[PDB]
Amino acid sequence: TRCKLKLLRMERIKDHLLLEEEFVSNSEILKPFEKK
């Protein structure tokens, strides 16, 4: 019950954080196109 609630709070800030990070990280401007 309660044990389950404690976990919800963490799972919803992990997803959010990741999603935002991801834009940059994947690229969107990084655009490797160097010689290799």
Q: Which residues contact another protein (rule: CB under 8 A)?
A: 1-7, 9-11, 13-14, 16-18, 20-33
| Phi and psi, residue 35, nearest 5° | -45, -50
CA–CA dist 21, 18 (Å, integer)? 5
Number of neighbours of residue 19 by Cβ within 10 angstroms: 9
Q: Which residue number, 3 or 35, has a Cβ lying nearer to another protein? A: 3
Q: Minimal distance in Å, beta carbon 23 to another protein?
A: 5
Q: Which residue number, 29 or 35, has a Cβ lying nearer to another protein? A: 29
CA–CA dist 21, 9 (Å, integer)? 19
Q: Minimal distance in Å, beta carbon 12 to another protein?
A: 10
